[PDB]
Scaffold this motif. Structure first.
Motif, PDB file in Angstrom:
ATOM      1  N   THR A 112      37.236  13.967  72.466  1.00 45.92           N
ATOM      2  CA  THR A 112      37.900  13.443  71.274  1.00 45.92           C
ATOM      3  C   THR A 112      37.364  14.098  70.003  1.00 45.92           C
ATOM      4  OG1 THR A 112      38.112  11.347  72.454  1.00 45.92           O
ATOM      5  CG2 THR A 112      38.609  11.356  70.110  1.00 45.92           C
ATOM      6  N   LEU A 113      36.041  14.252  69.910  1.00 45.49           N
ATOM      7  CA  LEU A 113      35.463  14.874  68.724  1.00 45.49           C
ATOM      8  C   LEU A 113      35.889  16.330  68.600  1.00 45.49           C
ATOM      9  CD1 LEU A 113      31.908  13.454  68.165  1.00 45.49           C
ATOM     10  CD2 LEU A 113      34.029  13.076  66.921  1.00 45.49           C
ATOM     11  N   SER A 114      35.845  17.076  69.705  1.00 47.57           N
ATOM     12  CA  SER A 114      36.315  18.453  69.669  1.00 47.57           C
ATOM     13  C   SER A 114      37.802  18.517  69.360  1.00 47.57           C
ATOM     14  CB  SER A 114      36.010  19.150  70.992  1.00 47.57           C
ATOM     15  OG  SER A 114      36.411  18.353  72.090  1.00 47.57           O
ATOM     16  N   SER A 115      38.567  17.504  69.772  1.00 52.52           N
ATOM     17  CA  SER A 115      39.986  17.468  69.444  1.00 52.52           C
ATOM     18  C   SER A 115      40.186  17.383  67.944  1.00 52.52           C
ATOM     19  CB  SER A 115      40.665  16.290  70.144  1.00 52.52           C
ATOM     20  OG  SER A 115      42.024  16.582  70.414  1.00 52.52           O
ATOM     21  N   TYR A 116      39.487  16.450  67.296  1.00 54.29           N
ATOM     22  CA  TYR A 116      39.626  16.349  65.850  1.00 54.29           C
ATOM     23  C   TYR A 116      39.173  17.630  65.169  1.00 54.29           C
ATOM     24  CZ  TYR A 116      39.121  15.150  61.029  1.00 54.29           C
ATOM     25  OH  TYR A 116      39.224  15.141  59.662  1.00 54.29           O
ATOM     26  N   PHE A 117      38.039  18.185  65.599  1.00 56.78           N
ATOM     27  CA  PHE A 117      37.514  19.372  64.930  1.00 56.78           C
ATOM     28  C   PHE A 117      38.443  20.567  65.098  1.00 56.78           C
ATOM     29  CE2 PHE A 117      32.829  17.975  64.825  1.00 56.78           C
ATOM     30  CZ  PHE A 117      33.020  17.469  63.561  1.00 56.78           C
ATOM     31  N   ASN A 118      39.012  20.744  66.289  1.00 58.09           N
ATOM     32  CA  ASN A 118      39.907  21.871  66.512  1.00 58.09           C
ATOM     33  C   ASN A 118      41.214  21.700  65.755  1.00 58.09           C
ATOM     34  OD1 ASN A 118      39.081  24.141  68.326  1.00 58.09           O
ATOM     35  ND2 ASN A 118      38.370  22.416  69.567  1.00 58.09           N
ATOM     36  N   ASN A 119      41.748  20.477  65.704  1.00 55.80           N
ATOM     37  CA  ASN A 119      42.936  20.251  64.890  1.00 55.80           C
ATOM     38  C   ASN A 119      42.650  20.546  63.425  1.00 55.80           C
ATOM     39  OD1 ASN A 119      45.149  19.496  66.580  1.00 55.80           O
ATOM     40  ND2 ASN A 119      44.104  17.560  67.013  1.00 55.80           N
ATOM     41  N   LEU A 120      41.477  20.133  62.940  1.00 53.88           N
ATOM     42  CA  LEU A 120      41.109  20.404  61.556  1.00 53.88           C
ATOM     43  C   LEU A 120      40.996  21.899  61.294  1.00 53.88           C
ATOM     44  CD1 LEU A 120      40.367  19.337  58.827  1.00 53.88           C
ATOM     45  CD2 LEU A 120      38.004  19.120  59.579  1.00 53.88           C
TER      46      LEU A 120
END
Lengths: 50, 52
Positions: B14-22
């Motif tokens: 989930t954290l990598s998901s937010y960071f990659n979307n950002l």
């Protein structure tokens, strides 16, 4: 309380199969008649604990 | 210290998901922002002679 895997002080890296259930690794047992059989009723007199 | 693989990997995902979307959004926005700064900077003063 020490029997409860959810209350296990150590990590749950041991046997996840030998455990009796999710609430106790070893069962507390059920009363048995004086014949080695399951005592599901009281009128069938229970004397032992198997 | 009271952790398991499942929820640890899920939280990391989930954290990598937010960071990659950002990061993707930042790069895609920077495309247009660089376009705008190029179209403006075509009209900014530039000193040419080496002597002030």
């Amino acid at each position: 309380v020490n029997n409860d895997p959810a209350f296990s002080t150590t990590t749950s890296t041991g046997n996840s199969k030998n455990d009796f259930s999710a609430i106790a690794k070893q069962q507390f047992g059920v009363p048995y008649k004086s014949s080695g059989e399951v005592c599901t009723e009281y009128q069938q007199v229970c004397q032992t604990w198997g | 210290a009271g952790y398991n693989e499942v929820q640890q990997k899920q939280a990391a995902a989930t954290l990598s998901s937010y960071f990659n979307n950002l990061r993707v959004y930042a790069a895609q926005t920077s495309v247009g922002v660089s376009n705008l700064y190029y179209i403006l900077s075509k009209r900014l003063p530039q000193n040419m002679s080496a002597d002030q």
